[PDB]
Ligand binder design. Structure first.
Ligand SMILES: C#CCN(Cc1ccc2[nH]c(N)nc(=O)c2c1)c1ccc(C(=O)N[C@@H](CCC(=O)O)C(=O)O)cc1
Ligand SMILES: C#CCN(Cc1ccc2[nH]c(N)nc(=O)c2c1)c1ccc(C(=O)N[C@@H](CCC(=O)O)C(=O)O)cc1
Ligand SMILES: *c1cc(=O)[nH]c(=O)n1[C@H]1C[C@H](O)[C@@H](COP(=O)(O)O)O1
Ligand SMILES: O=c1ccn([C@H]2C[C@H](O)[C@@H](COP(=O)(O)O)O2)c(=O)[nH]1
Lengths: 264, 264
């Protein structure tokens, strides 16, 4: 996508070499925002083939409030296996925070039902937020949340979403996240009988790892193609009842996949 | 300031009319970002006169862990009175979350001291974050956090900060908020012997209130004057040790004040 390849080049041209936690090295910038008008097409990168199976099962996993990779496993998704403990868990990661944030006094708050009731009952609210950054449980988490925080907005019947991402690996993880949250805005918009608007991505430390340098070069030389269109094939009676079969992506003619090693 | 005045012009050129919680009516855009290089000058608006007494005092109150207005009152700062209860209390807002976020296992996390340890011992961390958005306590808060989350970053011995403001009142609140976080970056950097980098502001619902349209156009007709300079006269043993008197702003000549109503 033009904005995405412009962020790749930006990093390449201005990033500073930093030693990172892995000991691989990064080239990074701090502060970047991208806007994707969703009316114009689905933001799935077309300069490399992106595979939806993982994107979709991971979002449905999250909305279930499940932090154990068994479902993911049962659906052939491997992305979280490195971080999961001895018997499948990640501790209170994304889905537990989304569906059951623990109050200090023992109650649990369901930020996705809150956000649903806010979109139907109070759509002009300036507080339609879901936060995964639970400072009090970060220590029990296999990995601190990368896509930490997000905010919805309604104006002239359209639903927009801004995501704050504290840490971003441009080559591998950024295409994944952009699509994931663009997909949640379409699910969220359908349930609330609403139009889709903008997806705004904002990042903190945005970086390209030293061993993805050739792959970036290879991806930057390809021309972006027309964006696909997402088809949602049936309306559930809740956001919690969507299934993998419900989604279809028409128009996606990508350049071939580029493989690149993960720095863990 | 060029950046601030361009944002106001943008809200005026691209905003949608939206009704707010206080029913006064706003003009809003969703998603903006702007960067202020702190080496260029101290970002206090000059197209209208700002009073620095309250920017410093509120920030020391926050760093104290305080959420009761009495301190602010004896330094006659009345910016928080409209929201405080009978006993001066605001409930667990900024100062309490920053200095003692309550966990579900009995602990409390001092997020400012943690940030300082990270800048000293692990400055390349992508996790140097302070969040006031505590979902399990928002119902005890007198007002939900508008400046909800901020991230620090250290590159070439320069400290930068990125603030995410979920709701922004552009005429009243935003000159207060930019000056407050630029102060904290200078204080942090002084304590850690770092130079100042950039303060990067990102907003969610960024808006102008309807009863502010004339004051905004008045402001916009003015030329920015050269930015002031911040001189700190002491290096306190800790960041919790600063006094009002340790700060001096040099060469600040603003255009006349412009007065305007608060929506409560
Ligand atoms: C992001 C995320 C979830 N994850 C992992 C993952 C890792 C660290 C994290 N760290 C943090 N802070 N939060 C997370 O949500 C998180 C998630 C991913 C893992 C691998 C690939 C990946 O290598 N993609 C390959 C192909 C495989 C595929 O299609 O799945 C590629 O070529 O793109 C993508 C996403
Ligand atoms: C941000 C922030 C902190 N705050 C708290 C705070 C809380 C709720 C809010 N609600 C709304 N609608 N807008 C805000 O800017 C806002 C700000 C402020 C409170 C008042 C003023 C204000 O009226 N100041 C006068 C100056 C005179 C004085 O010192 O009293 C002004 O004309 O600007 C500014 C900031
Ligand atoms: C809140 C906090 C601050 O210091 N600065 C701000 O600009 N605000 C503003 C935003 C909005 O005008 C109002 C809060 O209303 P709501 O909670 O968003 O509904 O104060
Ligand atoms: O949604 C995601 C998930 C992970 N990552 C990457 C960012 C960093 O490369 C790493 C997170 O590690 P720390 O920043 O906590 O060190 O995973 C992303 O870019 N996006």
């Amino acid at each position: 996508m033009k904005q995405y390849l412009e962020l790749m080049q930006k990093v390449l041209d201005e990033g500073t070499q930093k030693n990172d936690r892995t000991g691989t090295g990064t080239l990074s910038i701090f502060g970047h925002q991208m806007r994707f008008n969703l009316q114009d097409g689905f933001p799935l990168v077309t300069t490399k083939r992106c595979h939806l199976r993982s994107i979709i099962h991971q979002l449905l996993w999250f909305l279930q409030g499940d932090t154990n990779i068994a479902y993911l496993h049962e659906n052939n998704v491997t992305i979280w296996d490195e971080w999961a403990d001895e018997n499948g868990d990640l501790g209170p990661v994304y889905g537990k925070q989304w569906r059951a944030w623990p109050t200090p006094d023992g109650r649990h708050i369901d930020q996705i039902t809150t956000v649903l009731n806010q979109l139907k009952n109070d759509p002009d609210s300036r507080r339609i937020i879901v936060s995964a950054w639970n400072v009090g449980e970060l220590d029990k988490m296999a990995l601190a949340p990368c896509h930490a925080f997000f905010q919805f907005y309604v104006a002239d019947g359209k639903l927009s979403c801004q995501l704050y991402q504290r840490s971003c690996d441009v080559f591998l993880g950024l295409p994944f996240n952009i699509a994931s949250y663009a997909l949640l805005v379409h699910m969220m918009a359908q349930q609330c009988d609403l139009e889709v608007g903008d997806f705004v991505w904002t990042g903190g430390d945005t970086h390209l790892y030293s061993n993805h340098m050739d792959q970036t070069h290879l991806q930057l030389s390809r021309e972006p193609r027309p964006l696909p269109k997402l088809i949602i094939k049936r309306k559930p009676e809740s956001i919690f009842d969507y299934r993998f079969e419900d989604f279809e992506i028409e128009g996606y003619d990508p350049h071939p996949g580029i493989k690149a090693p993960v720095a863990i």
